[PDB]
């Protein structure tokens, strides 16, 4: 299908940036206790 | 292969008369061509006018003809344009112009013939390389 | 352009004089051991 | 009629004809305008002007 | 519609003979007696309608007309091609050895 | 004290995070101007007529390049060695066309890097150090002077300086090989021994010291933590590294004196790169690599090719294609 | 005065045509039995104007000013030819030789570079009829040839050319050659230009004249790869007349 | 898009330089 | 320029993924 090329990069980043943020904060939480 | 009398046999004149050179004269002719000529004619071309080379086929079609020792010696005495209509000693080294082309001052007539034989022998050894230019290096 | 040329000449000149005068200001004494 | 005036009188420049996920410039949709074609006058077989 | 005019000329007589209207002056070295004196005259007077018009060049000597007559078989004329004669290319076409 | 002495004391302060110094007073503005101009031209400069034949080469990202193909393009052959500041152009548009940024960058850069060398001496003095780090740096500095300044001098044009770009650099090397047979030049052969040998000796010394680290750690921690910064003692057994290396070859091909070992590490690459910088700097004056073209002939006198003749066939391909529109006469004499 | 090369070198004056005193408003008598020549014709452009592309809706293109980027390399000089006297009394100048072309690159707003072969090659310029003297109202109008900006040996960046070069896009071995034809096939153009030369200053004694010129010609088409622009060049000229 | 990308990466490196110098782990004498 | 439009996403993930990996390890280090 003739689909917006940037949709892919947009989706990947939309997923990746907020997810990595959350993981960073979780892992350094476990390294405390 | 070797340097043999049959290689070292070139036209003396245009009559068909030929002459046979020794190893020593051909080498003398090479040394002397290097001394007095090669600055412009290395490998049989002409740096200051590439349209004219020293291939025997070129020399043969000059006026007068120069695919022979006598006409080459004469050319070193009194050079002319390819068609023979103009003398060019003023800008081409010659015995006629030994004053302004100092390297010719001390050339003996036997030296000139050595230079001629070299020129006439060398394409028989190198073929297309002589007068060919950088294509054939 | 004329204006740019002058501005660069002055700037260059200023920095060059800092360099000369700085090294003229007793640079040999400026080391951690002997003050000659 | 100057082309500039006639181009305002065209709904493709109405800002209320777009969509949320139709991205980019207006030229990406209807294209890059080149010329006014002319003002169109319709007539029926009886020569009445129709609008 | 689009052709390389020099390649097209190689399929004419320019491709086989010396073209008095078009060829570079170094080609006249190919035959005895033409170079440089007559080659220059041919080129200076160069737009000819027929190869034999070259015998009417003002000033030839009787020996020159003879040399020319001996080499008419080696000459041709085709229409002047702008890309071959502009830039002084008839005197120096960028080719040496 | 007074104002000028405060300034002087700040300039030469050993308490500044980055040392300034008197050499730094020139180095900082010249390096900033070079860097800023270079970054802007690499991204946005329009095409430059490098060879002076009204045939502009595009070097910037925005005009169709990538990181590998882009460059700041040397200034026009039409300019030669003439000085072409911005104020000598009728307009910035003219300056960009003729390659003015190149001149601005290289001149500010050669000056800044020279003062970078002097700044290394200067701080070593203020710290109580021996002074010859800056000598080592002179090998790369001289290399830079050669490709950006000396070689243009000898050849008569900054159009033949090295371009500021990845592919531009390759262009420069290929043309150099055809015009000077640098591969057959002993000084560049010295330079290759310099850098190969630098790499080899670099790996050797790293591997030998690393091999004799004193057990100061467990297997779950980086060995690197067995060393503490400023610690009195050495963290490797140099006797053991000699014992290993002396047997690998023989006892006296090996260094047991640390000072002599490290002086060798300094001198090998520095000397070699001095020689290759001198090699560019003298091929700048057309004293070229050895020429063995048709050097072997048989009893008759046929040419018997060697590998030097095969190199020459390559050189000839480079020669006759480079700057394909730039030569009208048959010898390429500069 | 009598300057020397060493007075002029590097100043930009070598690109300037000579000039005549503001008081040289005389007349050069033309003797019909006589034969004349231009011994030196000098043309110094001062402005380059390029016709803008009026978009499809168009209305009318203008000639827009441009910026010269190729420096003081633009003038035509040492041009010579015979000044004939026609039977109707006009004068006709027929260029024989001279430095009669300069490549010029000017730049338009937005950044487009426009090269052109500023030239009067094969100029033929004639006066109005029955000219018994050259005066400060004498005009010549003429036409000249504009050959291709690049000549036949010129190789494009992928090695393609007319008289030399690759004849295809060799980096795209199995591309369809059809949409690449206009770039693969180099063409050599020859077009005409028109020039007016308006005599405004005459030294009837020395036969020097000077004035302004305007010419119109096409720019470079890159051996057929793109369409040329119309260019209007304006400037000044100087000529000296000598009996032949 | 390709120009933006090259410039972005170059810009990140320059920012890395700043932190690696001014916000380094300070060396101390243990 | 007719570039590969999968190049943008390859370049972006090439940077992001390993860099995130490093950042995660470094931060959890600074907090223990
Ligand atoms: C006030 C902000 C603003 C506005 C009005 C514009 C306006 C415009 N921009 Mg610009 N832009 C902006 C900010 C803005 N920009 C910023 C911050 C950037 C940097 C990223 C850019 C970078 C940029 C580029 C690179 C381009 C534009 C372009 C354009 C044009 C087309 C826009 C389009 O298609 O949108 C599309 C809009 C959407 C698809 C809506 C997106 C919002 C989503 C749907 C909401 C997300 C929902 C959220 C996840 C919900 C969860 C919440 C809940 C969990 C609590 C338009 C004139 C384009 C153009 O034509 O320029 C020539 C173009 O190429 N802009
Ligand atoms: C350490 C500071 C420094 C240094 C050494 C340089 C050095 C240079 N710059 Mg750079 N420059 C600098 C800072 C510096 N720059 C800064 C900070 C900027 C931003 C404003 C620039 C912007 C700049 C531009 C835009 C250009 C240069 C250029 C140059 C070159 C020649 C400059 C020239 O002709 O001066 C000549 C030097 C002197 C006259 C100084 C002599 C010192 C004596 C003692 C004083 C003489 C009195 C003097 C004439 C009085 C001035 C006024 C008078 C004319 C009325 C040279 C490589 C040009 C270039 O690279 O062209 C290729 C150029 O185009 N520079
Ligand atoms: C197959 C292995 C091999 C070997 C042995 C060599 C050897 C050499 N190369 Mg070559 N080279 C190779 C592969 C090789 N090369 C490859 C694959 C490439 C890339 C295609 C190159 C590209 C290359 C270039 C471009 C150049 C060389 C050069 C050299 C010389 C200096 C190298 C140097 O200092 O190295 C660094 C090593 C050291 C400093 C350590 C010492 C090494 C020496 C040679 C050994 C000592 C032998 C000893 C005296 C005898 C035994 C002693 C015993 C009695 C106790 C040397 C002849 C240069 C040259 O031609 O000089 C003439 C040069 O310009 N090399
Ligand atoms: C395996 C094959 C091989 C090898 C090993 C070499 C090895 C070498 N070649 Mg040879 N070369 C080869 C094949 C080879 N070449 C071939 C095939 C050709 C012909 C096509 C050439 C043609 C050739 C030429 C024409 C040149 C070389 C040069 C060199 C040297 C390059 C390194 C150098 O100059 O460092 C020296 C150091 C520098 C150049 C760096 C200067 C650094 C400045 C001062 C600082 C820069 C700072 C920077 C901008 C900012 C950093 C900031 C950052 C921290 C943020 C080295 C000896 C060059 C040479 O001798 O140069 C003098 C040279 O110009 N080669
Ligand atoms: C090509 C190889 C090469 C490069 C790139 C290089 C680079 C460097 N070596 C340095 C040092 C050294 N290198 C040394 C030996 C060697 N260096 C070698 C080879 C190199 N060395 C070799 C082979 C040796 C063995 C002899 C020593 C002994 C030293 C040092 O002491 C010195 C150092 O301090 O080490 C850490 C640094 C100089 C810092 C400086 O001047 O900042 C000043 C300039 C700055 C900060 C920015 C300039 C930016 C300019 C204006 C950019 C535009 C202009 C450029 C010229 C663009 C070029 C574009 C390219 C694509 C070609 C720098 C990281
Ligand atoms: C069929 C049969 C015969 C089988 C039986 C086999 C057998 C038993 C045979 C009999 C024995 C026998 C030898 C037979 C004859 C064969 C024979 C002699 C073969 C020889 C082969 C040969 C010539 C090899 C070449 C030799 C060789 C590899 C090179 C020597 C040159 C040389 C000295 C090289 C290195 C140069 C150098 C000085 C190195 C320093 C580098 C450097 C400073 C590194 C950094 C560093 C160094 C340190 O030093 C320490 C300390 C530390 C810290 C450190 O950083
Ligand atoms: C940190 C960055 C990492 C996060 C990024 C994650 C990606 C998020 C992407 C969200 C945007 C979706 C992009 C899809 C569009 C796209 O693919 O085309 C890409 C489009 C641009 O459009 C492109 O333009 C081109 C010519 O320039 C051509 O027309 C292309 O065809 C067209 O795709 O992107 C945008 O225009 C970006 C700017 C949008 C900003 C305006 C938003 C204003 C509305 C306010 C909304 C607030 C709502 C908040 C609610 C709570
Ligand atoms: C995990 C997260 C992602 C990690 C980073 C991802 C980027 C990694 C780099 C990916 C490769 C980049 C290729 C450019 C992108 C692209 O265009 O590819 C796109 C190409 C596919 O090609 C696409 O194909 C399409 C038809 O389906 C069309 O042809 C498109 O035009 C074309 O782009 O991707 C690949 O082909 C997949 C890669 C598989 C390669 C395996 C062979 C290599 C094995 C050698 C590995 C040795 C490595 C040694 C290192 C030490
Ligand atoms: C027939 C021709 C006519 C003859 C011509 C002769 C010309 C030859 C010139 C000889 C020059 C003298 C030798 C060099 C100076 C010196 O000895 O250094 C002094 C030191 C002191 O040595 C150290 O000596 C110490 C004792 S002391 O310092 O000497 O007192 C000792 O502590 C330590 O163990 C020991 O290593 O030497 C060393 O540290 C050992 C390494 C020696 C390395 C040689 C110099 C650098 C090599 C450059 C090679 C460039 C490679 C380029 C690659 C492309
Ligand atoms: C440059 C300074 C030259 C030197 C040294 C020598 N020659 Fe030359 N040669 C040169 C030119 C420019 C020309 C052409 C002149 C012309 O317009 O005709 C020549 C020509 C010859 C020829 C004729 C070749 C032909 O095909 O007809 C010969 C035989 C010749 N030159 C020989 C020659 C010798 C033996 C030299 C050493 C003593 C020598 N030349 C030096 C340029 C130069
Ligand atoms: C004071 C002082 C100091 C400091 C200093 C400084 C900090 C300086 C700065 C300086 C700088 C900071 C400089 C700058 C420079 C820059 C430049 C000079 C630039 C240029 C550029 C250009 C010219 C560009 C152009 C272009 C291009 C290239 C492309 C596109 C377009 C354009 C046009 C834009 C110190 C500490 C030492 C101490 C002493 C005192
Ligand atoms: O520019 Mn750069 O390169 Ca040294 O040679 Mn001549 O010039 Mn060009 O040719 Mn080959
Ligand atoms: Cl090139
Ligand atoms: Cl040339
Ligand atoms: Fe060490």
Compute the number of helices of chain G. 2
CATH topology of the largest domain in chain G: Porin
- Rg over CA atoms of chain F: 25 Å
What overall geometry of chain F do the principal axes of the alpha carbons give? globular
Query: What is the percentage of strand-forming residues of chain F?
Result: under 5%
Secondary structure category of chain F? mainly alpha
Structure annotation, total helices of chain F: 10
How many domains of chain F? 1
Give me the count of strands of chain F. Answer: 2
CATH class of the largest domain in chain G: Mainly Beta
Family (chain D): Belongs to the PsbB/PsbC family. PsbB subfamily.
Subcellular location (chain D): Cellular thylakoid membrane
Protein name (chain D): Photosystem II CP47 reaction center protein
GO biological process, one term (chain F): photosynthetic electron transport in photosystem II
Write up this protein:
This is part of a larger assembly, with nine protein chains of eight kinds. With 33 residues, chain A is mainly α. Chain A has one helix spanning 7-30. Chain A is rod-shaped. Chain D is largely without helices or strands and 51 residues long. Chain D contains one helix and two strands. A two-stranded antiparallel sheet of chain D has the order 1-2. In chain D, a hairpin with a 5-residue loop joins strand 1 and strand 2. The longest helix of chain D has 6 residues, at 3-8. With 97 residues, chain E is mainly alpha-helical. Chain E has one domain (1-86): Photosystem II 12 kDa extrinsic protein (DNA polymerase, domain 1), CATH 1.10.150.320. Chain E has helices at residues 5-10, 37-44, 62-71, 82-85, and strands at 18-19, 75-76. With 244 residues, chain G is mainly beta. Chain G contains two helices and 14 strands, in the order αβββββββββββαβββ. Chains in contact: A-I, B-E, B-F, C-F, D-G, E-F, E-G, F-G, F-H, H-I. The C-F interface holds C 1-2, 4-5, 8, 11, 15-16, 18-19, 21-23, 25, 27, 30-33 and F 4-5, 8, 11-12, 14, 22-23, 25-26, 29, 85-87, 89, 125-128. Residues 189, 192-193, 196-197, 200 of chain F line the site of one chlorophyll A. Chain C: Its main location: membrane. Chain C: Residues 1-2 are lumenal.
Compact description:
This is part of a larger assembly, with nine protein chains of eight kinds. Chain E is mainly α and 97 residues long. In chain E, 29% of the residues lie in helices and 4% in strands.
Question: How would you summarize the topology of this molecule?
Answer:
This is part of a larger assembly, with 9 protein chains of 8 kinds.
Chain C: H1 2-24
Chain F: H1 3-11, H2 22-44, E1 71-72, H3 92-98, H4 100-127, H5 133-155, E2 164-165, H6 166-180, H7 186-211, H8 238-248, H9 258-283, H10 307-321
Antiparallel strand pairs in F: 1-2
Helix pairs in contact in F: 2-4, 4-5, 5-9, 6-10, 7-9
Chain H: H1 2-22
């Amino acid at each position: 299908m003739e689909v917006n090329q940037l949709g892919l990069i947009a989706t990947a980043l939309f997923v990746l940036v907020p997810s990595v943020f959350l993981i960073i904060l979780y892992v350094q939480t476990e390294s405390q206790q | 292969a070797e340097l043999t009398p049959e290689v070292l046999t070139v036209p003396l004149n245009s009559e068909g008369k030929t002459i046979t050179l020794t190893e020593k004269q051909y080498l003398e002719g090479k040394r002397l061509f290097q001394y007095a000529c090669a600055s412009c004619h290395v490998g049989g071309i002409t740096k200051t006018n590439p349209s004219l080379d020293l291939r025997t086929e070129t020399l043969a079609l000059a006026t007068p003809p120069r695919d022979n020792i006598e006409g080459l010696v004469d050319y070193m005495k009194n050079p002319t344009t390819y068609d023979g209509e103009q003398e060019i000693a003023e800008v081409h080294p010659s015995l006629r112009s030994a004053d302004i082309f100092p390297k010719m001052r001390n050339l003996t007539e036997k030296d000139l013939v050595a230079i001629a034989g070299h020129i006439l022998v060398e394409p028989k050894i190198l073929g297309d390389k002589w007068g060919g230019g950088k294509v054939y290096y | 352009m004329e204006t740019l040329k002058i501005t660069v000449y002055i700037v260059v000149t200023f920095f060059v004089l800092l360099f000369v005068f700085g090294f003229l200001s007793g640079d040999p004494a400026r080391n951690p051991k002997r003050k000659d | 009629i100057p082309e500039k005036l006639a181009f305002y009188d065209y709904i493709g420049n109405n800002p209320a004809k777009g969509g949320l996920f139709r991205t980019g410039p207006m030229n990406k949709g209807d294209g890059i305008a080149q010329a006014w074609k002319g003002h169109a006058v319709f007539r029926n077989k009886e020569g009445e002007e129709l609008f | 519609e689009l052709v390389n005019v020099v390649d097209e000329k190689l399929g004419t007589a320019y491709g086989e003979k010396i073209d008095l209207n078009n060829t570079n002056i170094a080609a006249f070295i190919q035959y005895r007696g033409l170079y440089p004196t007559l080659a220059k005259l041919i080129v200076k007077n160069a737009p000819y309608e027929s190869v034999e018009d070259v015998l009417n060049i003002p000033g030839l000597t009787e020996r020159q007309k003879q040399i020319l007559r001996e080499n008419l078989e080696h000459f041709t004329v085709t229409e002047v091609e702008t890309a071959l004669v502009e830039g002084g290319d008839r005197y120096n076409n960028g080719l040496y050895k | 004290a007074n104002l000028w002495e405060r300034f002087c004391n700040w300039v030469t302060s050993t308490d500044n995070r980055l040392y300034v110094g008197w050499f730094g007073v020139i180095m900082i503005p010249t390096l900033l101007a070079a860097t800023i101009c270079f970054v802007i031209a690499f991204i946005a400069a329009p095409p430059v007529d490098i060879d002076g034949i009204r045939e502009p080469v595009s070097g910037s990202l925005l005009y169709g390049n990538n990181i590998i193909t882009g460059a700041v393009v040397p200034s026009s052959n039409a300019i030669g060695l003439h000085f072409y500041p911005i104020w000598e152009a009728a307009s910035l548009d003219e300056w960009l066309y003729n390659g003015g940024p190149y001149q601005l960058i290289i001149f500010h850069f050669l000056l800044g890097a020279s003062c970078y060398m002097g700044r290394q001496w200067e701080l070593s003095y203020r710290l109580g150090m021996r002074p010859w780090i800056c000598v080592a740096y002179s090998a790369p500095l001289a290399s830079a002077f050669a490709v950006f300044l000396i070689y243009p001098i000898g050849q008569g044009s900054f159009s033949d300086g090295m371009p500021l770009g990845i592919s531009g650099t390759f262009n420069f090397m290929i043309v150099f090989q055809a015009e000077h047979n640098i591969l057959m030049h002993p000084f560049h052969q010295l330079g290759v021994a310099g850098v190969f040998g630098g790499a080899l000796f670099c790996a050797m010394h790293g591997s030998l010291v690393t091999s004799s680290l004193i057990r100061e750690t467990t297997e779950t921690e980086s060995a690197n933590y067995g060393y503490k910064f400023g610690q009195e003692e050495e963290t490797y057994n140099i006797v053991a590294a000699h014992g290993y290396f002396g047997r690998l070859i023989f006892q006296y091909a090996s260094f047991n004196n640390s000072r002599s070992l490290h002086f060798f590490l300094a001198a090998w690459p520095v000397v070699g790169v001095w020689f290759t910088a001198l090699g560019i700097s003298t091929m700048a004056f057309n004293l070229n690599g050895f020429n063995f073209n048709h050097s072997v002939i048989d009893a008759k006198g046929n040419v018997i090719n060697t590998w030097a003749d095969i190199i020459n066939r390559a050189n000839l391909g480079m020669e006759v294609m480079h700057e394909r529109n730039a030569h009208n006469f048959p010898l390429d004499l500069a | 005065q009598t300057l020397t090369y060493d007075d002029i070198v590097g100043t930009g004056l070598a690109n300037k045509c000579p000039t005549l005193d503001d008081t040289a408003r005389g007349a050069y008598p033309i003797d019909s039995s006589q034969t004349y020549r231009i011994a030196r014709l000098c043309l110094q452009p001062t402005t380059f104007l390029v016709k803008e592309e009026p978009k499809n809706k168009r209305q009318e293109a203008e000639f827009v000013p441009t910026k010269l980027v190729t420096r003081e390399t633009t003038s035509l000089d040492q041009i010579q030819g015979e000044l004939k006297v026609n039977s109707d009394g006009s004068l006709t100048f027929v260029e024989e030789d001279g430095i009669d072309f300069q490549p010029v690159t000017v730049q338009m707003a937005g950044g487009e570079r426009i090269p052109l072969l500023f030239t009067v090659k094969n100029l033929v310029a004639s006066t109005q009829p029955n000219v018994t003297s050259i005066t400060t109202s004498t005009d010549f109008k003429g036409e000249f040839n504009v050959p291709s900006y690049r000549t036949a040996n010129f190789l494009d960046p992928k090695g393609r050319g007319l008289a030399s070069g690759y004849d295809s896009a060799i980096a795209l071995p199995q591309a369809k050659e059809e949409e690449l034809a206009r770039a693969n096939v180099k063409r050599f153009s020859l077009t005409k230009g028109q020039i007016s030369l308006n005599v405004a200053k005459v030294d009837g004694r020395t036969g020097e004249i000077a004035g302004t010129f305007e010419s119109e010609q096409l720019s470079d088409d890159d051996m057929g790869a793109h369409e040329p622009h119309e260019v209007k060049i304006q400037g000044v000229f100087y000529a000296s007349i000598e009996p032949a | 898009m390709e120009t933006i990308t090259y410039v972005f990466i170059f810009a990140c490196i320059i920012a890395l330089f700043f932190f690696a110098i001014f916000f380094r782990e300070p060396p101390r004498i243990t």
